[PDB]
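okkk here we go again. third time trying to get the diundecyl phosphatidyl choline bound version out, last two times i messed up the smiles copy paste (missing a bracket lol). double checked this time i swear
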Amino acid sequence: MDLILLMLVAVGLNIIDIYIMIEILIMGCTVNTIYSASLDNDMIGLIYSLIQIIIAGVESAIGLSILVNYNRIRNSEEIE
Amino acid sequence: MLFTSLLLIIVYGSLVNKSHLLTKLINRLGLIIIIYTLLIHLNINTLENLSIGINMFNNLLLINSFNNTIIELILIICILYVLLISFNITGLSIIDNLNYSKRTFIVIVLFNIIGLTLLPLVNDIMILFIIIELQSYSLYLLTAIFNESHNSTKSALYYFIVGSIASFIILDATVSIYDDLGLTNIQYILMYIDKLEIFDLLCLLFGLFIKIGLAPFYSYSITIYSLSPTIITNYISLMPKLSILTLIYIIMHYINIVNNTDLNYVISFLILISMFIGSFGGLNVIRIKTLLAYSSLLNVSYMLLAILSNSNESIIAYIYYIIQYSLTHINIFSIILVISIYLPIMNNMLNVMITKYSPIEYINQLKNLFINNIFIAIALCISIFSLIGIPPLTGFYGKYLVLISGLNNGYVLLSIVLIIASSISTVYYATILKVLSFDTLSFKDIISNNLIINTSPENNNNEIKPEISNVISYVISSLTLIILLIIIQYENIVKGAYLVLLYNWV
Amino acid sequence: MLVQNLIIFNIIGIVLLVLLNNNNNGILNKKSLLTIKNELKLKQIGLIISIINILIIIENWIGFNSNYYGFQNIERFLNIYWGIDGISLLLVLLTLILGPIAILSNWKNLKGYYTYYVISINMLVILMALNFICLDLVSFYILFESTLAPLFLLIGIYGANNKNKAAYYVLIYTLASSLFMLLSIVIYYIIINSTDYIYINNIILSINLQSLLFIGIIIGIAVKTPLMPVHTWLPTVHSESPLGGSILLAGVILKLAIYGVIRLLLPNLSEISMMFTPIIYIISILTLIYSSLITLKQTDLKVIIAYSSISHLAVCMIGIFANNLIGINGSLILCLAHGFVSPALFILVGGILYDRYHNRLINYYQGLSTFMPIFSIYLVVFSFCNTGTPLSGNFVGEFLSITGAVIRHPIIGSLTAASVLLSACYQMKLTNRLTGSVFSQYLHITNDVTNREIFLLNWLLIPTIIIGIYPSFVTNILNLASSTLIYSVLI
Amino acid sequence: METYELIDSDPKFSRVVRYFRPSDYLTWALGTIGAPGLMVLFEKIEPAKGNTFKMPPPSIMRIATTIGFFGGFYYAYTSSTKRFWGYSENAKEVAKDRYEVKKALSEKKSPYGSSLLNPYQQDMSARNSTNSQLLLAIFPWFNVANHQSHGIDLRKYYEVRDGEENWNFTLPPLDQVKDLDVAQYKEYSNYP
Amino acid sequence: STADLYGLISFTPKRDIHHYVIRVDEVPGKHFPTNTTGNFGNTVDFENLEPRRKPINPYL
Amino acid sequence: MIASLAGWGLFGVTVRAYQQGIRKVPFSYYPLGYVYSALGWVAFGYGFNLWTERNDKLLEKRVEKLKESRNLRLS
Ligand SMILES: CCCCCCCCCCCCCCCCCC(=O)OC[C@H](COP(=O)(O)OCCN)OC(=O)CCCCCCCCCCCCCCCCC
Ligand SMILES: CCCCCCCCCCCC(=O)OC[C@H](COP(=O)(O)OCC[N+](C)(C)C)OC(=O)CCCCCCCCCCC
Ligand SMILES: CCCCCCCCCCCC(=O)OC[C@H](COP(=O)(O)OCC[N+](C)(C)C)OC(=O)CCCCCCCCCCC
Ligand SMILES: CCCCCCCCCCCC(=O)OC[C@H](COP(=O)(O)OCC[N+](C)(C)C)OC(=O)CCCCCCCCCCC
Ligand SMILES: CCCCCCCCCCCC(=O)OC[C@H](COP(=O)(O)OCC[N+](C)(C)C)OC(=O)CCCCCCCCCCC
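finally!!
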């Protein structure tokens, strides 16, 4: 069911919904890293997992700021 | 030098008052920083010492002669770009003040230069993910530096989403390699190069192919380059390719150890499509930056053929091609920024709107450049004929060396296709030359008192006032003659490329 | 003492013209004295430069040994080796001779920018001349395609109404085809590590690889001679390019394909050249026959001359691919003779009639001998030279090329004799119309051929007659060089 | 390849600064004043605003000197480092280094010096700082620890070279020198 | 001479899974942050370590 | 080496001369610019010659090892 690109329907029809999809996709990689590190008893993989969480948080902030300013520009006359 | 000086500039810029003059002088400070960085790097890093390859910072980074050459190229090209914002490009306040409006312009560039230089040096999958995001985030900020521009913010929104998906693919590939092997250091992974899924590295390359606008992911790159300001498009369309292509060559160098034929075919398939879209795509377009975006896609495809072959001749071909293409890229965008002073002023059909961010936006805005400035027009013609591949310009030798690597490794189909694509792309390349000069003899006896340059006041009616500032005109003059007169020193330059080794030794 | 002096002097010549004309361009609103009389003092300097270029090769000609086998005047310059043999020496002289002739043709018939035109013409003459004295494939290709950039701008700026279409045709036809020749050159540098003339001539490659290399090289050559069916660009370019551009294109550029066969095919791909010879003859014979019949239906005056060059160079291709000395010498003789008669026909059509009436349609002209007797004398004489009438160099070239073709292939090579009839059919039908009947009702009486146009016609006619009556001036130089190109094992 | 004797693969920050030649301070001073000079030079080449020369404000001159001060020191630091690495002529540095090491050995003191870092941290610190000068132009990182991974053998300091006989240095065996790995694991093999 | 020179440089030596360059100069595990002596599965003795493979410098 | 640096200085004059045409000034405008331009590329030419001379030494040393590798292959 994945090869027919079923996930393209589960994503909503708003720009912020695309942002949510990216966070979920990146979160799946981090969960996989924790899964492998825990089985191996490897703290190096848990270091990688922590880095992925911190880096993904930075990505969300930058993307939101661009989207905030993009919404600001349209409602920017502010004559009142 | 970069990191320490960046912190000082960050604090200093926020302390002094907000003004165009201080921002321009701060931009010159950034120019000195990059120049000092180049001097320090050249003092300690040499080609001979780095031939073996030296690990750094607990083997997280690995520098060799191949990596060092690109870093030196990155610093040099960044110096030429800062000259645009550190000096006048047209001499007119209404046009030039855009570069001096944003104080964080030089700060964001210094952030990206750190990412660009460290990316080819990555030796761990963890630091690979960290650095690729460091470079990607800096590009998003630079694309959105003009936050009062609707197109600039829209492009950055597009850039963020496409790059984030590519970063996820890159992260997904590295995580899958860790699951199979449990190791994060690349050199440790090379011990198991014959026991890991080699198509996981193809997933890694797919993320890198997105970040360089390769087909089928070309569409976002063309849209972003056309909408972004010319001063921003000049950076974001060249700098990411300097570092990512170098990293792709290293990854392909490791992949060729197992020599997976299926891996080569998939990359060949993407190169074949990129040559089709790169050539036929630019045939029917009216924007100059849209035309250059297709030109960028086509030339990256030519370099990828050298990268895919990954042999001794590929090192010579790639190093030469990336250096000469960057110089041609700088020269063309430098001329485009300057020639905005020859635009006629209305004093209407098609209701054409031109903004201050992209004064030159259409190919036909280059009309009568042969009459307006014969030396600048010839400089553009030399650059365009280099992209075509007319010998003995720098462009011909780049394609000549790429063909050598492609045909030596047996890529007969791609070599023939790249030459058909070159002929097809010559059509839109020649269109630029047609606009510049083909109406010279009919418009020689014409009067133009409505040009932008005509609005510039004179000093005393006796001073010989040049139309162009000293710095930008000198850079165009230097780059044009290097492209034209490469035959004089071609033999020695290739000998320098002979000594760039990626673990060849003997 | 040749390439170094030729490049340095011409580069200094280019700089000298640029400094003088572009000194006062700084929105001075000036008048200046160099621009007086349509920039006479700038045209004169460029004309002097072309004359000096001829003297440069003459100094090396004095030391040329016709009894010495191998390249002479071997020189290292720009990391490139340069040399001269019998075949190269004559082709260089022809290229440099047409320099002043091309400049003098557009002396006072350009709308402006004479300095740009003069520099472009001299640049093209030197670049084409250097292409005959390079000693490797890479250097051959560099000069083979370097002429495209000056020529593309020259046609697009100084061209006729359809100059835009002509500029696209010459740029794309001659580049897309030459790139296939570059592929064969790249293959040589991959498997032999060198593209030197002497080095690659001694290497025998596999019969399949020679077939692939021959096809790649012949595509670039066949488009440039040109041969059917890749010839359609040439009539468009000639009918729209300026007269000086037509002279260089018809007199020099089309001869690079014949010289390319000498350097790139015969001594290095000798085994596959024998196999390809029947195919080359079939293409060239059809090129000769079809072009002559197509010329009978053309209405543009300059297009008719353009198609005539295609038929003659088909004979040159036939002669040069014959595996005997008679065919090879005749092909080289015909190239030199065509290098003078063909520009003269363009001068008569595109330089004399066009500069007065500005219309190239054939329906406007008839009975021109009534008020232009001097024009008709040269038109008739050059028409007979173009048709291969004896006492002209074209006859010597055509007869030996036909004879060499019959020696190479008695059955199908005999068809080359049809050039004697077919060439007279279209050339005389044009000349008979232009001189016969009453003077045209659509033309006003005006000046006959002036002194400047008399000079151009006379000094293009003189070499043709000298070569035609005493071709031993040319044969003696060529005999030793041409004998090396023959491949045969008689036992 | 111009190669010389290897002194220290990871020289200490104090050792690099102490071994500065007079030219190293000269290049440090030129870097300090060069950056303000370049701002003057850039204005002379093309003024920031207008067509006439205008001196940059003193606030720009102060920050430019600070940038040049760190830039000059980094250049000097790299030049001195190559002498320890052997990439540059270091006969002056070899003689000074050998005298210091022999003096420390004669006192039964480690040439590297006592460290607050345990055996793992000393090795870890060396891995982070070794060859980090290659990226000193990108970001700084210095060896500010007394670790024992310097890529040399203390045995080569026992042989007497020319001009060192008059030094009158007596060298005890390495196993009797404090703060050395060969003289620490006496009771336990896993604890120094 | 030029043809001979280019043949040497342009020749790419064969690489496979049995012969290729790995840039590791030492064996890890001599010191761990804590609990260095684990299940005694580390059989590599650093007191009797054989000489490592050294990288080749063609310019030296 | 003087002829080499003379050529580099000649190249620097060409760059300045080409700059004058771009800026639309007479070629005698500020003649001191040619002195600055020539000396700038002389400094680049001096460094370029050192780069090429150093590269020739490195190439020869590597060629020796390549010939040894080729001899083993041809046996
Ligand atoms: C002697 C000298 C010879 C020199 C030239 C040699 C090459 C000659 C090429 C001959 C083929 C092209 C000439 C004929 C094509 C005419 C196109 C055409 O008539 O219309 C386009 C056609 C749709 O037809 P339509 O738009 O409705 O036009 C009305 C027709 N009654 O649209 C179509 O249906 C075309 C099919 C769809 C597009 C297919 C594209 C796939 C790739 C094609 C090859 C490109 C290879 C490029 C390689 C480099 C780039 C990878
Ligand atoms: C053999 C090596 C030669 C290489 C260098 C040649 C000179 C380059 C031009 C610099 C000077 C300049 O641009 O000057 C312009 C000159 C002078 O023309 P003008 O009528 O006075 O100019 C008009 C000004 N008016 C109207 C006020 C008088 O015209 C040229 O452009 C001629 C030379 C270029 C011809 C070919 C162009 C494409 C080259 C592509 C290379 C692959
Ligand atoms: C192997 C030997 C190769 C020889 C050359 C190959 C054919 C060259 C055609 C000239 C085109 C030209 O001139 O481009 C210009 C022409 C303009 O057309 P126009 O004349 O104005 O009429 C048409 C315009 N209308 C209808 C308005 C009147 O635009 C084209 O056609 C654009 C497509 C050209 C692509 C050429 C790529 C060739 C790939 C390599 C061979 C497979
Ligand atoms: C209006 C203007 C129109 C155009 C006019 C053109 C006039 C040309 C001027 C004469 C030049 C001259 O004489 O060059 C000669 C000099 C000295 O050569 P060498 O040191 O022996 O080098 C060896 C030369 N071999 C190999 C032929 C023997 O080379 C130069 O300096 C080269 C100039 C740089 C060319 C650009 C390519 C190199 C870029 C390096 C960084 C990437
Ligand atoms: C040792 C190596 C460096 C060379 C020494 C000189 C450095 C420059 C400082 C002098 C002052 C200056 O540049 O002054 C500025 C001048 C003049 O500009 P203008 O437009 O006439 O100004 C108008 C002034 N009026 C009104 C009086 C006329 O600009 C130039 O001449 C530009 C060329 C820069 C120097 C050459 C650099 C070459 C680098 C290329 C190598 C990769």
